[PDB]
RNA sequence: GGCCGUAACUAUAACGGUCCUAAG
RNA sequence: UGUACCAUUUUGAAUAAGUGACGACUAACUAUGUGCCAGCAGUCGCGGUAAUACAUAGGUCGCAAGCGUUAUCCGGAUUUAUUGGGCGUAAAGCAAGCGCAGGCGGAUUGAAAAGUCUGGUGUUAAAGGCAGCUGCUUAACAGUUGUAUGCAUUGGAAACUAUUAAUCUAGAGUGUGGUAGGGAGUUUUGGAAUUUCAUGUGGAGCGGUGAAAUGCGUAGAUAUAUGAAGGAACACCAGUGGCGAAGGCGAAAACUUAGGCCAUUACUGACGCUUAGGCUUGAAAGUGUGGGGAGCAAAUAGGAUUAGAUACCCUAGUAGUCCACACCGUAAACGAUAGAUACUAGCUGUCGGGGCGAUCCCCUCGGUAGUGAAGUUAACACAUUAAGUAUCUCGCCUGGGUAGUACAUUCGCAAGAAUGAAACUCAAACGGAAUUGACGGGGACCCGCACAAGUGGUGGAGCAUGUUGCUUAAUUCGACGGUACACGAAAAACCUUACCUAGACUUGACAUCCUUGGCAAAAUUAUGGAAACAUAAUGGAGGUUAACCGAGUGACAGGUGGUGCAUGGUUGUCGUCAGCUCGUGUCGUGAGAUGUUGGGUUAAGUCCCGCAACGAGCGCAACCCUUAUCGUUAGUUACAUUGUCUAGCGAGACUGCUAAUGCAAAUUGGAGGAAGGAAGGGAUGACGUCAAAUCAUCAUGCCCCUUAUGUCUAGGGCUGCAAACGUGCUACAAUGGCCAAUACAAACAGUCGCCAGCUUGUAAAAGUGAGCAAAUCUGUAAAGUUGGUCUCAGUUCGGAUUGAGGGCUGCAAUUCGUCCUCAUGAAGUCGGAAUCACUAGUAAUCGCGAAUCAGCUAUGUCGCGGUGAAUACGUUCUCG
RNA sequence: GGUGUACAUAUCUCCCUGUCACGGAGGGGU
RNA sequence: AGCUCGAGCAAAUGACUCUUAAUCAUUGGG
RNA sequence: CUGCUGAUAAGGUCUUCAAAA
C-alpha cells in the first residue's frame, strides 16, 4: 500500500530542517517560504550539471544565508568566478535588494551516498535513452562501491516508452524503512523522456545513528574536507 | 374446456397468470 | 538465305525494370489517415482514436525479365510405420469359451534340392538416369563410351525353412495313487421375518416428516399371545477367503455331472499355440404362452416443498421382480491390461497338495494378495500373477463434431442387435498425466464488536446537509457496493466560479526571445456609463534604466478543453492482517518443490525444537511521541493554605526474583512495586489485487481551440422540486419544562484582534473605554446542588412554518446571510420488514476551543475536559 | 381496475442481496 | 410516417462504458 | 442432523530483448 515520506516521517527526530528562521508575521511567513521554494528551486532546475545534493537557507529579520552543498563546484564558480556574479544577481532579484545575501558554496565530500545527486543522475540517464537495466546496474553497482549499507531504486512510469505502465525495483542490502534510527536519505525525481514523464525514487541506507540528537551535524560531507567560499 | 400476456426483422408462442369441472 | 557469323563501318547512353514482402515462422521499419468501421490473412491472429499486421508515403529487404496468386503431384508426415507406430488411464484387447481352414512350431539321423547362396549362358529394344569425353563463345543442349534390374536354362553348395523315410522324450495328453473346493443341472426338506385371515386381553390414537399433511382408527387401530395360509430371499459361519473360461456361485440332503492341484521307476511319441469363417454360453432390463403373487416398486393418483416441481420426502399402486418352456444377445460384460512360451533381486501374509510328526513352525510344488530394486513409462504407476527382455498367432486404432446417425444387408414377433459412411464444419477436442492458485452448500486448526450478553441509536415526525431523478438559459465538474453520498468544498449573496444571458478585447489579463527608447505604472477626481472601457485632469515611487514603463515584432502566450484505459506524484481497500520473496544447495525430463510445511508459544513467518536444507531482504517487534510514580535543575507572569505547577535531564519495569512444567522458547500463580508480563493511546501500513480514485492541487505524452474552447465586467445560477436514499440535529417529556441562587475544568486563541468595567436598550447590540503581543489581560462553563412552580394533558412538551418590528457584517442581505423581540403554534405520545456503533474513563451524556471566515440554521470537521455505565457463559450458527 | 373472475395477478415504495430473481413490510387503482 | 395499429417498433443523435450490447432521454420523419 | 438456496450479455491488455558490460 502506501508510505509515508521516509524523509517527512524523520524529520524533527533525526533531521534538521532544510530552512532555518522565524518570521514576523503570517504575512511575511508566506512570503519566505515561498521565496525558499523559488530559490532552492532554481538551483535544482538549473545549474544541473554541478549535482548540487542540497541547498539550506537560513535567515533573520534582514539577512539571508544560503549554503549550497555541491560535487562539483567548478560549474557554480565558472571561468574567473563569473557565473558566479550571475546567480548571485538572480538570488537578489528572487528575493530583493534590500536584503543582505550570503551565499556559500560547499563542496560535499563522498558524494556518491547521495540520493538527490543519485537520483538526477538515474534521470538524466533515462532521459538520454540509456537502456534501463544497465543504467539502474552501473548506478547501483557504484553506490555499493562507495561504500554504504542498501540502496533501494523504485523507477515507475511508461517504461522504455511502452503503452502500458510498469515499474522495476533494484534492492541490494538491508534497508530498514520502519526503523527510526537508521540515516535513510531519500530523494524523488522526474526524467522527462519524450513518450512522458519517469518516476525515480531512491533510499539509501547510510548507517544507524547511536547518537542522539537533532543532526546539528554534517552528513556525509565530513569524509573528505567540506571547505569552499563565495561568501564574505 | 375457456380467457389473457409472452422470444433482439416480422410471424407464432417453448413459457407465465387465472376461472370452472368428476376429469378437459 | 544475303541467314548465322565477321570488320577499327556512321550515329549515339543513346533503345530497354518490375514484382512480392517488412509482428513471429522468415532476411527487412517509421510517419500520415481510418478507428471492431474500411480492410488483411498460409498458420498464430491484426483493426474498439497513439495500428511496425488495414489504406498511402518514405525507407529497407527477396528475386529479376521476370515476380506474385491459383490448381495438381511428391517430400517434410514414423501421419497406414516390410524397412518404420501403437492398444491400463490419451483413438484402439471382441463379454467369454469349443474350435475346421490358414500362420507358427521340441531333439537326432538319411535322401532329394521346392525355398536360400554361388559360377557359366541367353535376354531384359532404342531413347531416359549416373560416370567420363567431344562440339556448339561456356552453358542449357547435341553426340559418344561405360554403367544395372528381373526372368529362364544349366552346373555346384547343404548351414537354416519346406517335403519325404524313420528314431527319442523334454512339450501336450492318458493310466494308477494322493485331493481341495458356494463348479452345474434335476428332485425333495427346514427355520427366522413380513403380510393377510381367525381367536383372546385393551382402550385413543397409530403412521409419517426438516416440519407436517394425505392415509389407517370407537365397525375397537398400534400393541400383545396363540394358530393357519401363501410367496420371495437364505442372519451368524463370511474372510487383509474358495471355485469357473466369462456372466456367476453361500439354509440341508440325494442323484446326475464339469474342471483343477500334487507325485509318478507307467503308456502313446510332437498328437502342440493361435484362430478369419462356424458353433456354445452370456448380469439386469425387455418379449410371447401358461402358472404364481408375501414384500418391494417403473407408469399412475393424492399430500408436501417450491417462483414452478411432470423430481428429491410421504401415503397408496399396475406391469415387473418368482417358476416352466421359447426368444432378445446388450453392460463401467473392468484387472478399462487377448492367449501361449522361455528368462530377470528380494521381503511379508494367506489357501491347497506333498515331506517330517501335537498345535505352532521348517522345506518343496502351485493358486491368490501387499511391499519393493534392476527394467519400462509422458507421468501416474507396472514390477516373476509385468505395463520388463523376446518370439508366435488373432482382434483392433489412424484428429474433434457430424455419428454410433443415414442408406443397403443379416438376425429378431417387437423393442432392437450386428455392420457402418459421406456431404458440411473447427483448429483444435466434455484429449491423458502432473504443477501453482482460486473456489467447494469438503474436512482440521486459529482470529476480528463477527455471532452471543448488554447499552444507545438508525428505518417512523420536523429540520440541516449531500446524492439519485426531473425541470431550467445554466442548474459547472468530479466521487457511485464494501473502498461514493456533512465526499473534493478548512466557509457558493458580489469575488470564489470552472455554468447561462448580455456588454466589450485580440502577440492579448500573464511570460520569454529578439531591434529599440525610457522624461511610468498605480491610485483618485470629472463626463458618458449595469460595470467592463473610453475621452481630461494631479502626471508622479524611483533611477536614467535597475525592477519595471514602453513602441516594433513573429516565434507564441492562454485552455478548470478530451483521454486517470498513455503517465509521474498522492491516496482508498484487503490490513497493522501476517504475509511476500531472493542467493546457494538438493529433488523432478518440466511447470515446479524444499527452505515458508511438522510439534510447542505468541498479536505476529515472534521465538524455540524437528527437519535436504543453509542463510538473507521487506514486513512483525524495539528504537520515536504522550499518559501513569519519583529524583534533580528553575521559581516569574506560576505557587505564596508553600510545594502544586510548568519544562529540560534522569531514575524506574528488565519475565528482574520466586513456585509449578518444559530440552528450550516459553505459559500460569505469588512477592515487592505507581505501573507485570505488547502498562494505556498515537506515529509507523511489505510484495501486490481492484486497468480502484484524482489530467479540476501540481507536473506531463498525445489530440483539439487559436479575433476563441483564450480575456474583462454586470446580472442570474451552483440554494429549483411531484419524488427516493445516506449522514446528522431537535423532539415525542416528570431521570422532565420554566424561574432564582450557586460550586467545580482542560486545551486552545487573540493587536483590522480578544474585549474587562460603566451607560443605554425587553434583547440581539450601540457608545465610552481601560488591560493584553500574553503562565500577567480577555474569551460568563454546562450538566451537577438547593429552593419555587407545573401534575401526565398533544400540555407551561415539541419547535417547524408563518406575519411584524429591530441588530451586525458587507458597495449590496429580493433570488440567497445570520441573530434578537413580539405573535402563530405542522408533525410527533417511542417508530414496520430490516440494520449501526461500542470491551473503561469505553459507550451514553454536558459544555469549551480552533482551522478556513468581513458575515454565515456548520446541527459539519478537528481537538479539550465534567459526570460516567452494562456485558463477554461460549464458537452451534452469521460476515470477513 | 391493466388481465382472469371484493379476490388473485399485475403496478409503485422500502427492506434483502455484489446485482437480479425469489422472499418480507407498506400503498394505491372499478 | 420505413413497419404493425398519435402509440409501439425501426432509424439517428447524445448520455452510459476500455469499446459495445442492453438501458436512458431527445428527436426528425405523414 | 438433515427447510429452501436459481441465475450473472460480447471482444479484449500486460512483457519489451540480451546482444553485454
Ligand atoms: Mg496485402
Ligand atoms: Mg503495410
Ligand atoms: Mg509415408
Ligand atoms: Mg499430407
Ligand atoms: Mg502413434
Ligand atoms: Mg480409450
Ligand atoms: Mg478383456
Ligand atoms: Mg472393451
Ligand atoms: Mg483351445
Ligand atoms: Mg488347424
Ligand atoms: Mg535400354
Ligand atoms: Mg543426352
Ligand atoms: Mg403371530
Ligand atoms: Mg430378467
Ligand atoms: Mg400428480
Ligand atoms: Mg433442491
Ligand atoms: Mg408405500
Ligand atoms: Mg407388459
Ligand atoms: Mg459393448
Ligand atoms: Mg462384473
Ligand atoms: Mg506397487
Ligand atoms: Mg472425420
Ligand atoms: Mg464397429
Ligand atoms: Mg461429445
Ligand atoms: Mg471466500
Ligand atoms: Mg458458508
Ligand atoms: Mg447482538
Ligand atoms: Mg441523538
Ligand atoms: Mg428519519
Ligand atoms: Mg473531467
Ligand atoms: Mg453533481
Ligand atoms: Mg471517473
Ligand atoms: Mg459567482
Ligand atoms: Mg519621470
Ligand atoms: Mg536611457
Ligand atoms: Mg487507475
Ligand atoms: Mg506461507
Ligand atoms: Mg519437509
Ligand atoms: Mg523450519
Ligand atoms: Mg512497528
Ligand atoms: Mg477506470
Ligand atoms: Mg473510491
Ligand atoms: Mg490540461
Ligand atoms: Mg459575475
Ligand atoms: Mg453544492
Ligand atoms: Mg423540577
Ligand atoms: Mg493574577
Ligand atoms: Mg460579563
Ligand atoms: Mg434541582
Ligand atoms: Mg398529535
Ligand atoms: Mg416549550
Ligand atoms: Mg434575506
Ligand atoms: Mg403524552
Ligand atoms: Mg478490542
Ligand atoms: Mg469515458
Ligand atoms: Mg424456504
Ligand atoms: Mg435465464
Redesign the pocket.
Known sequence: ??????NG?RF???KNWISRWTAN??AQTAKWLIEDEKIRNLFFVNYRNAQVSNVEIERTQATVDVFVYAAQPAFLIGSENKNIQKIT?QIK?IIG?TTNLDLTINEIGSPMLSARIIARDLANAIEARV????AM??SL?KVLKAGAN?I?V??????????????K?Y?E??????????DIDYA???A??????????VWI?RGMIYT?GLNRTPAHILHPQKKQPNRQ
Open positions: 500500500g502506501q508510505k509515508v515520506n521516509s516521517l524533527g527526530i533525526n508575521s503570517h544577481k532579484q535588494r537502456p534501463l537495466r544497465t546496474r552501473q553497482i542498501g533501494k523504485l523507477v515507475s512510469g511508461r517504461l522504455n516508452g511502452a503503452e502500458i505502465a510498469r515499474d525495483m534492492i542490502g538491508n534497508m530498514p524503512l520502519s526503523t527510526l534510527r537508521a524523488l525525481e522526474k522527462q523522456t519524450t513518450y512522458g514523464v519517469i518516476g525515480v525514487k541506507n542522539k
